[PDB]
């Protein structure tokens, strides 16, 4: 899309918005911001649950000035708890109308633990144990981990540990077991709470007489019941797969795919062995992933389908339709998910059932046509693709102006660049109808267009690899029906800087003054900046150390002064370094 200054006729447009599942802090004076641009002065309202909702009437709620940012004041007293549910916010201007996303306003809860009388669970030396947490409804899902009462952080390695779900998992139980009390614990992010369950303990009764006394045991599954499950993650996501085995070798957890390699870039281990995680997902990653809890006396398979569905994702988002009078356009709403997005389309936050009737509107589909577009049906479209999983909203609006070609940056720029780079000219501009910008060389009537010059939407021009001839003077104009305007830029191709002569390295006894020769070819006409570096930080002049114009002399080495020494030489196009290394003796 395009930017418009203020100045400019403008319909409405939303800077900045708050989250989807907004959640929140009861302390704080509670803010949601909803800010607009527009030409015209934009009014903003708010609507809760499919109802308006008044800021005036509410003493607490008060507006931020020439925005829609609403600020509510908690000193006189009162509760968030009853602000909970679906918010909308609304910016209009006399050109048009524009919305933003259903706000589901919820407050995080850090609720305390419901006191329960715990008898304390009891094993034969060598058992397996499933130890549960199950916390209070939790939104979001807490940070979920296991301590004593000492207050110690609890015992955890490849035997034994904690599940993302929260409970934690003995494959086997040992004597050691009952010295400490186990307790869950789980974090709320906002509110900086920490929950403290009622804390365990054990009994173990080995019979065990003097005469690996101990009997050994087969591998079994604990938390992945029978052969096989089914998992859904959405594209993009993070990716997570968790295996628990119970063996009396404590058994070892190896996670693999069917007929593939894992991308090692991506994928690592967690939680000792016990958990996969993988980057952004695609549908490459989709299949069937399984996990061995191999053991010296058995070993066995957990087989996982990993469907990779999704929530939408866009595309092609519909970007502003700018036309003249009579021109055709469309619009594409393009998103994909799995299972596939539906599609919803409103006109002004209105149903397409009951919108006031256009002969040039013709919808298809999931794209929607104007042919021969006028000033009629100016407005602001909404598309709305959802799925089980979840959903994204796309507004476009199209505005209809006449107006001449105009320049949109400094006119005569100046800029420099060194032979073998990439380098840009910006040339900003904008038209009522779409004018065409050209650009000309050295007084050259034919307009610069094909090899080694390319052109983007918004009129700069990339010169991928520079010549010595590409340097001059160049004009570029966007002219369209109603007229023309001009801009001059000068373009310099100058002399990179290299570094032709390095230090030397050497081995040096101490109280010797050493130097260390760094000559660098630059440009005549422009700023170079020569530095030095000591092992990897940037080194200090001071006494006893002086810098030649091609060269660095210290006075009296010791052991301290041994390392690496690194010559920067820099200017505002360009860049190099130099290393070298110095070694010390003994008396
Ligand atoms: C873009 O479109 C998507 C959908 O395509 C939309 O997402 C929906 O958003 C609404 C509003 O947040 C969600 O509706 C909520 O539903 C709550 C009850 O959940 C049940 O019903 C859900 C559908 O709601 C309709 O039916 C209920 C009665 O069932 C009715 O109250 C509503 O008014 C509405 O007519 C349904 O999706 C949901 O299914 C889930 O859970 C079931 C098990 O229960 C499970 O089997 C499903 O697989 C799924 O997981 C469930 O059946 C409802 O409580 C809530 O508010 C209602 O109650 C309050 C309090 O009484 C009232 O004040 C209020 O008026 C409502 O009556 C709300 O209505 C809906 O679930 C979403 N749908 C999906 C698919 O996610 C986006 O918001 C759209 N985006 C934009 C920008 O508009
Ligand atoms: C103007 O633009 C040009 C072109 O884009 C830039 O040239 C790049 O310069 C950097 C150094 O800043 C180059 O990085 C070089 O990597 C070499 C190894 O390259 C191979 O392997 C890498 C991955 O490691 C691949 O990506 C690449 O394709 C190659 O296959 C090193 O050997 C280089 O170091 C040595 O030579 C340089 C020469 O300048 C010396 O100064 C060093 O001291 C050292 O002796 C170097 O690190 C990069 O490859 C260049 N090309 C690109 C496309 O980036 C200029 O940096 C830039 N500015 C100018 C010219 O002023
Ligand atoms: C997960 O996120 C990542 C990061 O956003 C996504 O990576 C993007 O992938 C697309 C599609 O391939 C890329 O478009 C390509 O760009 C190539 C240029 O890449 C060079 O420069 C990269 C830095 O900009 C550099 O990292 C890369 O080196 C790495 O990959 C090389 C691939 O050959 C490999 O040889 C190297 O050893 C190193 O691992 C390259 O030097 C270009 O060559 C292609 O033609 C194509 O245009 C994007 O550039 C990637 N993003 C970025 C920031 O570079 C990834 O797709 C995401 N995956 C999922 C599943 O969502
Ligand atoms: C008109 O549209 C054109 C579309 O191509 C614009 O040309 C592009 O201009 C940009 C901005 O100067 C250039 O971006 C370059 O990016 C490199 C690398 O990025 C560095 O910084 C990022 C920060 O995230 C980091 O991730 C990278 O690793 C790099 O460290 C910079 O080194 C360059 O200086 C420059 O910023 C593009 O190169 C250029 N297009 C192409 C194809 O090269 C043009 O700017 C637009 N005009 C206006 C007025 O907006």
Not at 49 to 75: C, E, H, Q, W, Y
Not at 304 to 313: D, E, G
Not at 425 to 435: A, K, N, R
Request: proline share 7%; aromatic share 8%.
């Amino acid at each position: 899309s395009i930017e418009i200054p203020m100045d400019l006729t403008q319909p409405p447009t939303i800077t900045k918005q708050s989250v989807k599942d907004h959640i929140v802090d009861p302390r704080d004076n509670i803010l949601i911001e909803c800010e607009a641009k527009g030409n015209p002065a934009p009014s903003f309202h708010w609507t809760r649950n499919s109802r308006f909702f008044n800021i005036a009437k509410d003493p607490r709620v008060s507006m931020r000035r020439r925005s829609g940012t609403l600020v509510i004041d908690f000193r006189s007293g009162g509760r968030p708890e009853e602000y909970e549910g679906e918010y909308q916010c609304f910016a209009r201007n006399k050109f048009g109308t524009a919305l933003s996303n259903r706000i589901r306003l919820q407050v995080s809860k850090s609720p305390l633990w419901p006191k329960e009388n715990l008898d304390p669970v009891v094993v034969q030396e060598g058992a397996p144990l499933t130890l549960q947490c199950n916390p209070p409804p939790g939104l979001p899902s807490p940070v979920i981990f296991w301590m004593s009462s000492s207050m110690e952080p609890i015992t955890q390695d490849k035997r034994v540990s904690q599940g993302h779900n929260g409970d934690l998992y003995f494959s086997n139980v040992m004597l050691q077991d009952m010295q400490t009390d186990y307790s869950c614990n789980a974090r709320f992010h906002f509110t900086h709470t920490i929950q403290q369950k009622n804390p365990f303990t054990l009994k173990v009764l080995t019979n065990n007489p003097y005469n690996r006394g101990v009997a050994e045991r087969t591998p079994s599954f604990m938390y992945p019941q029978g052969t096989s499950s089914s998992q859904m993650v959405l594209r993009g996501m993070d990716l997570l797969l968790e295996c628990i085995a119970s063996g009396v070798p404590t058994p070892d957890i190896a996670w693999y795919k069917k007929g593939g390699d894992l991308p090692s870039n991506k994928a690592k281990f967690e939680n000792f062995n016990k958990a996969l995680r993988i980057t952004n997902v695609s549908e490459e990653d989709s299949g069937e992933y399984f996990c061995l809890a191999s053991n010296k006396m058995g070993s066995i398979r957990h087989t996982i389908s990993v469907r990779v569905k999704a929530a939408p994702y866009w595309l092609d988002e519909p970007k502003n339709l700018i036309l003249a009078p009579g021109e055709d356009g469309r619009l594409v709403c393009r998103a994909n998910g799995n299972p596939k997005p539906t599609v919803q389309w409103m006109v002004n936050g209105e149903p397409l059932q009951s919108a006031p009737p256009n002969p040039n509107r013709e919808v298809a589909g999931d794209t929607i046509i104007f042919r021969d577009t006028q000033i009629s049906s100016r407005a602001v479209y909404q598309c709305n693709t959802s799925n089980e999983h979840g959903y994204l909203l796309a507004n476009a609006f199209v505005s209809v102006l006449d107006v001449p070609p105009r320049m949109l940056s400094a006119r005569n720029q100046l800029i420099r660049v060194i032979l073998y780079n990439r380098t840009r000219l910006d040339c900003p501009f904008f038209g009522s109808p779409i004018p065409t910008l050209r650009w000309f060389k050295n007084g050259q009537g034919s307009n610069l267009d094909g090899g080694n010059y390319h052109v983007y939407e918004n009129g700069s021009l990339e010169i991928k690899m520079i010549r010595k001839e590409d340097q001059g003077i160049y004009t570029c104009v966007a002219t369209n029906i109603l007229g023309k305007a001009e801009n001059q830029v000068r373009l310099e191709v100058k002399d990179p800087t290299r570094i032709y002569r390095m230090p030397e390295d050497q081995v040096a006894k101490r109280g010797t003054t050493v130097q260390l020769e760094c000559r660098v070819k630059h440009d005549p006409s422009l700023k170079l900046t020569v530095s030095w570096l000591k092992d990897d930080e940037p080194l200090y002049i001071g006494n006893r150390m002086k810098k030649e114009d091609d060269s660095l002399t210290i006075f009296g080495v010791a052991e301290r002064d041994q390392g690496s020494y690194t010559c920067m030489a820099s200017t505002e196009l360009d860049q190099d370094l130099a290393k070298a290394y110095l070694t010390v003796l003994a008396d």
